[PDB]
C-alpha cells in the first residue's frame, strides 16, 4: 500500500497519529479505524480501575460519553516542546498529548501519555496504552454521573 512505501519511522508515526485524527473526525458511520481486529486499549495507571477494552468496548464507551456529556469538536495536539518517541524495532510510538473537547458543562482538556504499538508491518494499531490524569479523570467521571 502507500503506507508500505514509506520508511518505517514515518509509517509508525502516521499509524499512531491516525488514532487522534480518528477521534477528531469520529462518526457512527465509520467508527474507530486503523486498528487491528484484536486491538486493545489499556488505561494506565492500574489504580484508576479501568479494564482493558476491545475496539467494540471502546466504541460503546465513546458513543455514550459523547451523548451523555454532549461532547464535540475534539482536538488533540502534542504538548508544546514534546516530540514523537519512535522505537522502530519494537513498533512503538510514545506521545505526550493534550486532548480538548467542548461539552455541555464547559470544556474537557487533559494531558496524557500515549504508547501506541503497531502490527509488524506498521500499518495498524494493535495496542494503545494511555496514562491519564487520575485526579482529573475521577472528577470528570463524577460530573458525568447524575450529570
- Chain centroid to CA 66: 15
Q: DSSP character for 97?
A: E
Q: Which is nearest to 118 in space by CA: 138, 144, 95, 88? A: 88
CB of 62 to ligand A1D8G, least distance (A): 3
Q: DSSP character for 53?
A: B
Contact 48, 132 (CB under 8 A): yes
Contact partner, 65, from Cl ion, ligand A1D8G, a second copy, none, Cβ < 5-8 Å per class: ligand A1D8G
CB of 83 to Cl ion, least distance (A): 10
Per-residue binding letters, 6-35, with ligand A1D8G (x by CB under 6 A) = -----------------x--x---------
User: Is cis: bond before 45, omega within 30 of 0?
Assistant: yes
Applying the rule CB under 8 A, the residues between 13 and 32 that interact with a second copy are: none
Nearer to ligand A1D8G, 51 or 81 (CB): 51
Applying the rule CB under 8 A, the residues between 54 and 83 that interact with a second copy are: 83
Applying the rule CB under 5 A, the residues between 56 and 115 that interact with Cl ion are: 58, 115
DSSP assignments along 113-147, one per residue: EEEEEE-TTSSSEEEEEEE--HHHHHHHHHHHTT-
Q: Give contact residues for a second copy (rule: CB under 8 A).
A: 9, 44-47, 83, 85-87, 89-90, 92, 94, 96, 110-113, 115, 129, 131, 133-136, 138
Amino acid at each position: 500500500t502507500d503506507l508500505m512505501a514509506l520508511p518505517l519511522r514515518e509509517r509508525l508515526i502516521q499509524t499512531a497519529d491516525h488514532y487522534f485524527r480518528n477521534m477528531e473526525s469520529f462518526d457512527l458511520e465509520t467508527g474507530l479505524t486503523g486498528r487491528t481486529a484484536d486491538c486493545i486499549l489499556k488505561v494506565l495507571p492500574a489504580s484508576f480501575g479501568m479494564p482493558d477494552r476491545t475496539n467494540e468496548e471502546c466504541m460503546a464507551a465513546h458513543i455514550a460519553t459523547r451523548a451523555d456529556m454532549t461532547m464535540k469538536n475534539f482536538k488533540a495536539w502534542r504538548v508544546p516542546g514534546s516530540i514523537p518517541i519512535v522505537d522502530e524495532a519494537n513498533r512503538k510510538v510514545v506521545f505526550h498529548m493534550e486532548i480538548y473537547a467542548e461539552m455541555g458543562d464547559g470544556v474537557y482538556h487533559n494531558e496524557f501519555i500515549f504508547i501506541m504499538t503497531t502490527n509488524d508491518e506498521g500499518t495498524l494499531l494493535k495496542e494503545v496504552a494511555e496514562y491519564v490524569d487520575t485526579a482529573a479523570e475521577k472528577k470528570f467521571a463524577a460530573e458525568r454521573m447524575a450529570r
